[PDB]
Amino acid sequence: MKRIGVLTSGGDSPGMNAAIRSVVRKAIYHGVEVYGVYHGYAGLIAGNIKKLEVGDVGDIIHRGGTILYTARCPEFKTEEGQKKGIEQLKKHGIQGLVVIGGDGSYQGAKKLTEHGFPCVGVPGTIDNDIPGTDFTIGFDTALNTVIDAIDKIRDTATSHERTYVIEVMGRHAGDIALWSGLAGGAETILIPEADYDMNDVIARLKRGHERGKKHSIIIVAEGVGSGVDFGRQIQEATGFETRVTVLGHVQRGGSPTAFDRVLASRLGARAVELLLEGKGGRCVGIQNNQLVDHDIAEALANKHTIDQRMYALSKELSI
């Protein structure tokens, strides 16, 4: 390969720029040339491409978001979209593509290979819900963002002896809520991958009140439901002064943590190695603490799960 492309698609995540930086630096060290695609898939169609020099990626390792931007491109589900895209590609003589993003982004990389455009996917999401990897780029960062909030909430919850329901991100995966809850020392964690009984939850809170703890923290993954409904329920059933906080999009931004920076550097470098060595239609990840690569097709057919033992431990550590 003489020339590759790199794009970010799906919801941005902290560490995407460190990823971009390794793709660009890896490729060039190898003498290959890198072209950035702006606005993700949508930009790819609109032929929104510009070469990236080694310095275009200096001073970005520590920044959140993506300097390549991102957008929702429904028009790419289409053979027409895909054609227009493949055209744009060829028009710049971009031979290969590194896609950094969600799973909606992986599908696109799949479709592109089926049309003979070698693509490698890099998992960038705060969610951790991407098959093929233990951890996605941006998850560690989001986690630290949430525990930052929890730490703060804890101060005021303590002061006023109140119960707080904190809604975190992950529409389909409980990683954020699970790791957060654990690290935060939350009395209750509601994730989608585990059954919960509101009676039990209540029982445990009352019991904790008794054991002398007047404040309490409850984490709820948006996937399960609304922070407001649980707060309402919890308050009606215990009589505790209850407050609800929805973290929101703060979970998406910020300067990536060291782990997210090391992870994104390693994975972005690897994706380039695959393109050169001709492997295409692969997705990178980290499993059992080792750098791996899978067929997108077989990884996409795979499912996202959480360590139920971790979830259990959560319950044993609550007072």
Place this chain on the structure above:
Amino acid sequence: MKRIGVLTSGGDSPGMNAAIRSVVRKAIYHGVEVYGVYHGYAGLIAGNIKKLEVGDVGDIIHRGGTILYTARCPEFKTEEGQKKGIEQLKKHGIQGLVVIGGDGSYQGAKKLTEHGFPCVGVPGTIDNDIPGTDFTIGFDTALNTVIDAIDKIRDTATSHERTYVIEVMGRHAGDIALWSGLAGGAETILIPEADYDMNDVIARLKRGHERGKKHSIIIVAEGVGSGVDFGRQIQEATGFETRVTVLGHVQRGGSPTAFDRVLASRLGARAVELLLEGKGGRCVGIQNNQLVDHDIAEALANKHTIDQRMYALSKELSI
């Protein structure tokens, strides 16, 4: 004086512990003895008092919340409440009282002096809405908490080219939203002390879109209204992809900033100086960068205002 008391009332704020620490250390250096009142006014009634040794206040300067707790005590509006309180006081031979808290807390200190219990108020609120001081204890901290959020939001807003409405605290004062907005480089700030015309707001956003900025940040003080209503309005009228974030109680917790720590140390020390020197029914503050003290009565009759010139500047700095 041989023995004083210290309490925290109203919503907790970062820096209350540094305040507690200076009251305790100041007093003892002076050979006076300090008694802590737990759960604020409510605890004062229930005679929830315990002496504080010099070391009871070691390792708290950097902690948020208040180690004395706080509670809402409606029963204190009452002569009966006030009696029960004054009784409890005398029963421990506590001669004077340092009250750290909101204005609801100042009233209580007023009522107590009218019954001959020398009280000095210390402004502790994230709000900055307390007459008699340029700055209250906890405001700087809350500010840094909000800009922390804004910084994050900015990353994702940039990435996806979206408009964000961020709701911050202050039910009656726009300090948080004003300083935040300014420091955050927000395109629009909605505070209660300034008239706004939704048409103009819109005009400025569209105009900014034109000048080439595809993302935008709007700050709204809860006092003005709901982040959701403005978001709805802004989106309907511009067609911009709009998202809303409510910061909530995270604004209340955290390890106080250096300024909040220096401020709370200085003011808590001063309040003790007043008690000893017999001045009672006073409130402390910082005005024109100098340590001052006022009659609670005349400070409570005074009103809270913001620097309108600062608000103006906000508009000139928006692209």
Place this chain on the structure above:
Amino acid sequence: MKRIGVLTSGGDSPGMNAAIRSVVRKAIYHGVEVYGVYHGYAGLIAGNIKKLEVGDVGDIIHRGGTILYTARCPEFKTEEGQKKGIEQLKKHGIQGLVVIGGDGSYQGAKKLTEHGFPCVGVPGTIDNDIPGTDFTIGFDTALNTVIDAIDKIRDTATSHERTYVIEVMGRHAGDIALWSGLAGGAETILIPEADYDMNDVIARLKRGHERGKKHSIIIVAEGVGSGVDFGRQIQEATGFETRVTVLGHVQRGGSPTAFDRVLASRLGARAVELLLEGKGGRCVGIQNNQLVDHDIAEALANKHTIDQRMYALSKELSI
């Protein structure tokens, strides 16, 4: 005025970019045009100037350092330097100059006015040692950086029951060490503006050891001397397990705090107001919490002092 210039000189400080941003935005709102001077004075000589558009200053409010760079320019002490500079100025038709920086930078602004080039100085230093202002741009930020370190040191000092000597910046002013020490709850603060007796320092440490506190934190402004000498002295005279930490240049970088951002916005805006209204050879500041401006000459003839009462309080708050 139709066209102004802006430069940063002396040691960079967090908040310089927010300053740059207000100068650029203020001026343009006023219809004036802004030219950036790169590498400070040195760049000014080498005619290293480039116009700044409204967007050249978007996304910098939150960044540390200065996008204009800075350098040491000894050659400017010279009439020749000054000529070459004034030439460069005129060659671009830049009529006025906003200088952001230390006092070495103010002198240069003085010399420039004496040659009829209207200049306004903006105080940018982590030091706080600039006459004409209570606070300089970057001081609050440096303070939060130091207390961040102190907080950490406290954890390990506590764990191991050790004494730590922490050297902070300020070669001629004790502001950093004084505010830090206070906010940090340091047992001892050594600043240059106050006499200290090593015997007393020792006495207080031993006494504190006795009162039951096994760890201790000592802050020393580089101006007084080396962290290593004091550590050596303190250890030899108490027998306490002593460790020394030199913070260094970390004090200079980072994303400016809210206060530093609001301060730099307000002051940079003001400096522009002065240039337009013809006032030149002035320096801006904040005194008694109000925006002021002075003649550089009379402010430079003035001296930097610290609130000795604050220093005293430091001693009364130590256990």
Place this chain on the structure above:
Amino acid sequence: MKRIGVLTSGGDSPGMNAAIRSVVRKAIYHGVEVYGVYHGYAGLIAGNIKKLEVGDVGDIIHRGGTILYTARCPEFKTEEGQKKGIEQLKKHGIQGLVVIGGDGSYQGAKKLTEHGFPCVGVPGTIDNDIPGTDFTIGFDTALNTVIDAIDKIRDTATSHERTYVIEVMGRHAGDIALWSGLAGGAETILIPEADYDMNDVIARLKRGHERGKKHSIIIVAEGVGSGVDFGRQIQEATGFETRVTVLGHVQRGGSPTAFDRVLASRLGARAVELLLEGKGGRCVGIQNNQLVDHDIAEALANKHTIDQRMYALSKELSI
């Protein structure tokens, strides 16, 4: 088992309290009783033990250092020490021991089992240099602390176009410097496990200067040598304006990161599981992202290594 003990020994690390918290909560859930040993081994000798109730470990998950303190106990190398210790143990009827700490701490746990006192070791060090685990408790935290510094240094290094040598901790392992350097986007990393040639280092810096980058960051693990010697060397050989910063003990303190909190919770819980189930003389860890346990003897005979491929990548990512 009816009663266990828990201690912290060696240099404190962020996450030790979260570890303490899981040991205490795990054990009690299991109906076993926990006794804390203060001042590590030294305290164990001096019979400095006190039971720990479920609430003694509330509000510590987020704190750095160790609420159990730690000390250097040379006297424990001794059969006499060990006897005095085993005596103290029995005198409280403490049957098992959870040791959290360095490897110096593991030896002690070994010696204790050889005397029939079932002990389980938990890896707590900022260093990551402990065999039997991919990661030790406190490493992630130290990493984030260093990149925090690097980020700051980068701002000032950029502003002034200078080269900085940053000395980090790890006397025998390069993990900190390696991960830091990578995450920090350092131009050079000097670790002990890899050969370096000062000529090459120089070559790369000059070359980078050429490619247009005027600032540079160099990380050096204390293990390799002094930041001052390298700075001196680098400056003499390039002519670049060079500055040196030694991070020091700040690397040891702070509120543990989410990963350090989850890791310490999981491992501390596991160590208790081993004690109950009779396994003693084991050490816990995380390998290939799975919770494991080893014989202390065979893990101590094993060696600490770094991923050389990671080190390589470091070089390919430098401009």
